[PDB]
Symmetry: C2
């Protein structure tokens, strides 16, 4: 049973926390709810931490006073198909194995499921840790509350005696590295320097042994990722987001200068031994586009290569923790700005980008974004109660489960069936274009070995490799992006038609050169 501490004693040293805490809606909430600092208080100085206090990072620490939000946060949507592979005629990318080749995603790329599972799913997917981590039982796949309480309560390490990345099962990969975890958990928020730079005060960095880092982490999407625990104010904590918006001055809405003045991030920096260590970004308004955009964006969180000379770019380089902060039509220029590509296609030899869930950068410029709508309006609205305080739901999911709040409050002349039909019209149209982009891209790729074997020149092959970069970018954006065009149907349509145009041009060039060489 908790005993409150003398907050004034803490404030004597912790003046920034004092300024945040005394002024906001947690002014009456005592430190003991989230910190055990008895030995710390006995041993600290103005400058030395002394004994490190415990910080309780479980979402359950908030549940004593916010049970409603915590229960919603831990909830599971069983209708979100679990562990469903995308390289599959029943899913998003039937030809993915041809198109992605030997990239790590070829070992497994499933569709997303409920937020409660995010850290568990990161740990156990076949592409991440060589199959090292596994659910303790296949019964455990249902346990959202268990996952929230801690990954290691439901999964286990197949070899606690070693820390190396290796394969435990034949068809797995070891693609995980420490940067990944920033979009799964912030349990390490006090143990990771801004951007993951090596730092005297950081136990973990981009260059850490990822198996050891994994074992130190527990909880998914911590509540304090979107709310400052001291002031309650809305914020973001994700380093690479703050870097793009603030350090690089690109703004919260990089395509809209006025909106970027209306929605702002105010950086706060915390130090260790008088040296800058970590940052947060305080929001002036609770804009969920920025909160959700901590994770639902295209990023680098992985080694790659330089476009200029092909040299490896490893985890020591800041480019391996980067938000591109660009729409699909600006992405190629943004990747050139950092002189970077992800992988060389195993079949075609083309340098290629690897794209991931660019929801926010797709949403920019869309009709709903232009009308001031945000992610949470459609995916995470308030509950509706005849006789209750209407809190915000806290496990985002498709608007199909909540159409009256998500759509019909604005679109008041539609029935639920009509609004869903409008969704399906866009998704069906967009999916059809994705299928055709895959047909043409796979056709181009399958012709590369024919061309090489027929003696087609390097000049022709290099021309088509350059087309492959763009054919790939303007296809993969849309298999990566989870709305199947709904977030921006006109952009999806223009981009996918560009992918097809490029692949058709590449097929034509290869067929002509093969026929000439023959022969």
């Amino acid at each position: 049973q908790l005993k409150p501490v003398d907050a004034l004693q803490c404030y004597d040293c912790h003046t920034q926390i004092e300024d945040m805490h005394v002024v906001g809606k947690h002014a009456t909430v005592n430190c003991v709810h989230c910190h055990d600092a008895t030995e710390h208080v006995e041993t600290a100085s103005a400058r030395r931490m002394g004994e490190r206090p415990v910080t309780h990072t479980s979402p359950e620490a908030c549940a004593s006073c916010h049970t409603a939000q915590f229960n919603s946060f831990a909830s599971v949507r069983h209708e979100s198909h679990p562990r469903e592979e995308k390289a599959n005629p029943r899913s998003r990318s039937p030809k993915f194995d041809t198109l992605i080749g030997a990239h790590g995603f070829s070992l497994e790329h499933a569709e997303p499921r409920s937020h409660a599972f995010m850290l568990v799913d990161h740990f156990i997917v076949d592409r991440a840790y060589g199959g090292r981590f596994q659910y303790k039982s296949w019964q455990n796949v249902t346990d959202g509350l268990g996952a929230v309480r801690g990954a290691w309560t439901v999964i286990e390490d197949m070899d606690p005696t070693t820390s190396d990345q290796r394969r435990f099962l034949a068809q797995t990969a070891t693609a995980a590295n420490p940067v990944c975890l920033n979009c799964k958990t912030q349990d390490h928020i006090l143990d990771w320097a801004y951007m993951g730079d090596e730092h005297d005060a950081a136990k973990w960095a981009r260059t850490s042994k990822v198996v050891d880092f994994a074992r130190d982490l527990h909880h998914p999407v911590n509540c304090y990722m979107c709310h400052d625990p001291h002031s309650t104010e809305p914020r973001v904590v994700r380093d690479a987001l703050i870097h793009a918006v603030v350090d690089q001055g690109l703004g919260t809405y990089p395509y809209d200068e006025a909106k970027s003045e209306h929605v702002t991030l105010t950086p706060v920096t915390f130090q260790r031994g008088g040296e800058d260590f970590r940052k947060i970004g305080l929001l002036n308004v609770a804009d969920s586009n920025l909160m959700c955009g901590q994770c639902h964006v295209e990023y680098n969180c992985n080694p790659g290569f330089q476009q200029s000379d092909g040299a490896p770019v490893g985890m020591d380089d800041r480019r391996t923790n980067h938000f591109f902060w660009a729409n699909v039509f600006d992405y190629a220029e943004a990747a050139k700005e950092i002189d970077f590509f992800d992988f060389t296609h195993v079949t075609t030899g083309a340098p290629l980008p690897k794209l991931q869930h660019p929801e926010l950068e797709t949403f920019w410029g869309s009709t709903h974004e232009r009308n001031g709508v945000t992610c949470a309006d459609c995916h995470m609205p308030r509950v509706k109660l005849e006789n209750g305080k209407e809190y915000t739901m806290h496990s985002p999911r498709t608007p199909r489960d909540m159409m009256n709040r998500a759509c019909l409050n604005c679109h008041d002349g539609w029935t639920e069936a009509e609004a869903e039909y409008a969704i399906d019209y866009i998704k069906n149209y967009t999916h059809g274009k994705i299928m055709k982009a895959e047909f043409w891209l796979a056709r181009m790729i399958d012709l590369f070995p024919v061309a090489k074997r027929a003696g087609v020149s390097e000049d022709v092959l290099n021309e088509v490799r350059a087309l492959h970069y763009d054919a790939h970018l303007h296809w993969e954006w849309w298999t990566a992006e989870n709305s199947v065009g709904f977030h921006n149907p006109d952009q999806a349509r223009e981009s996918l038609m560009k992918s097809i145009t490029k692949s058709k041009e590449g097929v034509g060039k290869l067929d002509a050169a093969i026929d000439a060489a023959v022969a």
Copy 2:
């Protein structure tokens, strides 16, 4: 059908021309509703010649208005059919005590769907002595058949005679020609204004009702609310025109400004130059007036004079009368025409008989004050994602259509909330009706005890006067079908008045009995 030359008709029918050429039926030929070949061959402008036929079936309109016709014939199976009200499961458990020997004691069922109204009027146990009966108990479901014609589904047990008499032991012969005006207007060209005897009218208040019944077929004819020549909104019910115009009360007798905004313009049709029949053209399609042609308290029956007790028979216009007054003005209105309905068989008190006063109850209520009308809650437009949204044509409880009937205005309520608010009012009102019955029955049951104990005529007469008001302020609410929802504060005040009167009467009888003993 082959169209007639309407220009030829107009040469002798300027009154119809003026209505037909300007409205939305200008292109609709006379042949849809009239057979006039022999009429044209034989008429002059001053001589009818052969009487042309006028088609009065709602199905005459269905050639071009099938959507409205289909809705009009529809049946709500959830509206409990042939359910007696003198019943612990229905509106008036002590009705047999309270009404005594009145004709309604033979049978008084709850209403059901409009399609059955004429059929139900013909076959109820209190109307024709059981003379008319469904041909089979299977026929009770047949709304469409009833619309097409009562005599396709019911039959006369003795076509060879025309007298009112009992065919079954517990029946009554309460029907008379005035009843039919709220069931059908098939007789619209055969009935003079108010049912006065008239050379041009084959039927009148004084007609042999059994013969009149056999000439009638269809329920609530479409043209009761719509002029068939111009399409404009109208009423045709004589007693309503008489209340609004002849009695000078106006369309909304409790709101002078609203009576100026909603106007009834009477139009009279002549026969051989003598006034014969009337309609009332409305300036707006006001369903309060359209529905109030029938859903009102009325006389449509013989009675007695308050002054001297003399019978008032069907020859007297008072037997076709709309009081057009709220419950608190009703006693005054009935005194104005010197009329009461019956003498209670037990107490000997002159009493009024009240019937479904929905319009006069609705007046002054919150919804009426806000411009809502009957059809807004009971007969709204259909709801279609991709269609022309026509108006439904068989009125029913808003519980079947809550979004349209209530939640479009009350946008902060769920369906369950709105129904909850209905039920709160109906439950509360029903509880007061039960208490009013308890007390009125206790008072009535004490009359024989008082008489047998030798209580004086003076005391009995004081209590008979109280009976009039205790009865009025109870029966209004068993007669009115909303169980208070139409005007909850008025139901509350009125029922508490009934109870107060009955309690006073009980006290007076008990004191006199005790003294006499």
